[PDB]
Amino acid sequence: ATDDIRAGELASDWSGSPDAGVVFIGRIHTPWNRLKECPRHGRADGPVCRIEVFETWLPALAGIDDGTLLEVFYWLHRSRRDLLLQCPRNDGDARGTFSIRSPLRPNPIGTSIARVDRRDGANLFIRGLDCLDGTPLVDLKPDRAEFMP
Amino acid sequence: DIRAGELASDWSGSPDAGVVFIGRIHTPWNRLKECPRHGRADGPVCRIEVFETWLPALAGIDDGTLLEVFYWLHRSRRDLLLQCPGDARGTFSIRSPLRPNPIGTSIARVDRRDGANLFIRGLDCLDGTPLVDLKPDRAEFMPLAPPKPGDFQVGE
Ligand SMILES: C[S@@+](CC[C@H](N)C(=O)[O-])C[C@H]1O[C@@H](n2cnc3c(N)ncnc32)[C@H](O)[C@@H]1O
Ligand SMILES: C[S@@+](CC[C@H](N)C(=O)[O-])C[C@H]1O[C@@H](n2cnc3c(N)ncnc32)[C@H](O)[C@@H]1O
């Protein structure tokens, strides 16, 4: 059971159904096949990853090209969703889930601010991600600092 | 039903995952045209109501905490690919509330915490918008977990 929690942690017994549905709009390809190999957070000088946007949404890439700084939203598909208190250092220092950027969340939405190296059709070659190879894409937006000074 | 120059997808498939509404955001704006395009730090005070189930997860958030607030734009059509928010633009190239997954964010500082309620300025959503996540904003958060090999990996 990946169900066990660390000392100091707290899991919710909540078992309701979802209120809305998320569509996976692409797939993110990265160097990392194991969670323990992933960066905690991406770095802008990091390895090139490839965001493959699915064919339905290709026209929505209009305006994104080489160099565009993006806020990339992805679904952390391996994460449990029930933790309320977490101890990211496994030392009994428990923090509310909303006070940390842990991938374990009620809605496991991850973001990275990441600049497109190169675009080739549906593929965005991009630096600055931190997710497992094959992580689902859920949204792309222009980063605030570049889009709105 | 769209403007000349826009493009919609005629895609109709089931969702791949489910989103849980963890709260509700209470704001001054009852109509879409009343909402600011983006939130401002000196805008009207709003109330983020976190539902009972997730109250314990607010531990560590208090007056003065800088948050990244994620909400579900529940009134948005999800099919637009080119939009005229002026030449039409790709949906992914703008911060429009009309998106395949209509997730909005605002970066805003908690003015006051009271139990499951956060009183906060800098939002832009319709009164009654569902909350989907809260994170400490990057500008004021330092990751707690220890470094991993990926943290040291620089690209060629
Ligand atoms: C700390 S989270 C930060 C996510 C994002 N940078 C953010 O701030 O929202 C990054 C971690 O999520 C984990 N992870 C990466 N891909 C994942 C996936 N697809 N499902 C669940 N966990 C994942 C890895 O342990 C990685 O180190
Ligand atoms: C331009 S979007 C930006 C959202 C967020 N600040 C971001 O950058 O991700 C803000 C607009 O979304 C619209 N809106 C607000 N709440 C909504 C809701 N619940 N459903 C659909 N549209 C909404 C309003 O027109 C508002 O001006």
Swiss-Prot record, chain A:
Intrachain disulfide bonds: none
SUPFAM superfamilies named among the record's database cross-references: YaeB-like
Gene3D superfamilies per the UniProt record, alphabetical: YaeB-like
InterPro entries listed in its UniProt record: TrmO-like_N (IPR023370), YaeB-like (IPR040372), YaeB-like_sf (IPR036413), YaeB_N_sf (IPR036414)
Ranges of residues in domain TsaA-like: 22-149
Presence of keyword S-adenosyl-L-methionine: yes
Positions bound to S-adenosyl-L-methionine: 39-41, 77-78, 101, 111, 130-135
PROSITE patterns associated with the record: TSAA_2 (PS51668)
Keywords: S-adenosyl-L-methionine
Pfam families with a match to the protein in the record: TrmO_N
Record's subunit section: Homodimer.
Family per similarity comment: Belongs to the tRNA methyltransferase O family.
Protein name per the record: S-adenosyl-L-methionine-binding protein RPA0152
Organism: Rhodopseudomonas palustris (strain ATCC BAA-98 / CGA009)
